[model samples]
Target: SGLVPRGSHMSNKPSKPKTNMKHVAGAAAAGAVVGGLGGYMLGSVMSRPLIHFGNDYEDRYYRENMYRYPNQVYYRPVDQYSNQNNFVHDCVNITVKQGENFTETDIKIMERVVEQMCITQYQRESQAYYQRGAS
Candidate 1:
């Protein structure tokens, strides 16, 4: 027995095959793309479309003023720039008419607004000119 190799009893398992990188990472990357939608669905189901609509109506401050003020349910007339509530709608109406298509409610409503606040604001100058004309 002494003639045999000194310690051949020590044997090692095969070297660990790192050959799993493609199998693990390839499937892991593929599964990442598939499972990533779980987080998206969680948030989407939490927040609803009606909340989005209410969120959008919150944007209606422009149309809010347009409809809400003009209708007088909430506020005042457009013709008189300054109203009882002490807010003026300003002269963007004319800018919109000439710049954009002068059609539909914008045309008619803008005409009504232009006729009053548009001309009413000029009363002082028009009277001064009128005096010169009569003389």
Candidate 2:
């Protein structure tokens, strides 16, 4: 009576059920499908900025460039691109255009907008890295 049986002293909490690998696998597959659809929707929305429009134009660099271009409110004739910027934007524009109707003018305009975005993104990242190195 002085020494309790070790098993008897243990609480009556149910032991964890053995793991079911098949259930785990099925859940993982379902989660992946849900995640993939969500990602696809997000990707489609984010890619809309590839088009030349007011929202895309509102980004800081575009606004600054617009300020500089007093005569130019439109994007194409004045857009600038370096090698890397052009490559990335062209890829995004072309990919964004897939399975959809597009005219040469639309393609060209999208190319310009994406190129501008790529340039701004590149410059911002470069500056960020440079500044980080300073400290």
Candidate 3:
């Protein structure tokens, strides 16, 4: 399948709002209402992901194990999970920036994306994990 482009939450400008701005519940609720009607009317307009706050245990688990980008961190994976089921663990040595704040929820979302996209070394490890257990 071809790659699908997800537009940036903000336009290409330093003055633009950050991703966290959309995390606000009221704005997101209004945005959802508008987006649903807009898409229904137009048939093909794109919309960003909606957010609704709630307590989720899986979200907490994924975020705790996520890593930062290579620019601010270095990482390596060890192929040994708790189950010894040929699992892999990746660690990042990160340099904390002055104003960069990564929330637990962000980490959870990033971890999901990393798994879905199979980025870097995680790709090989994920394939092996699924292949052995399911097949």
* Candidate closest to the true structure, highest lDDT: 2
Model 3 vs. true fold: TM: 0.20
What is the lDDT for 128 in model 1?
A: 68
- Which portions of model 1 miss their true places by more than 4 Å? 1-97, 130-135
Q: Can you write out model 3's per-residue Cα lDDT over 55-126, one digit (the tens) per residue?
A: 576545444434342122222333433432122122221212222367755554543332332233445556
| lDDT of each candidate versus the true structure | 0.34, 0.41, 0.36
lDDT of 2 by residue, 1-135 (tens): 597765646568887888666543333334334322221112221222322445654455444443222121111211233466444555445434433244544554444554555444445556766656342
Error of 2 at 89 (Å): 5.4
Q: Which stretches of candidate 3 lie over 4 Å from their true place?
A: 1-73, 77-88, 92-100, 114-135
Against the true structure, candidate 2 reaches a TM-score of: 0.34
- Candidate 2 lowest-lDDT run of ten: 70-79
RMSD to native, candidate 1: 22.9
Candidate ranking (lDDT, best to worst): 2, 3, 1
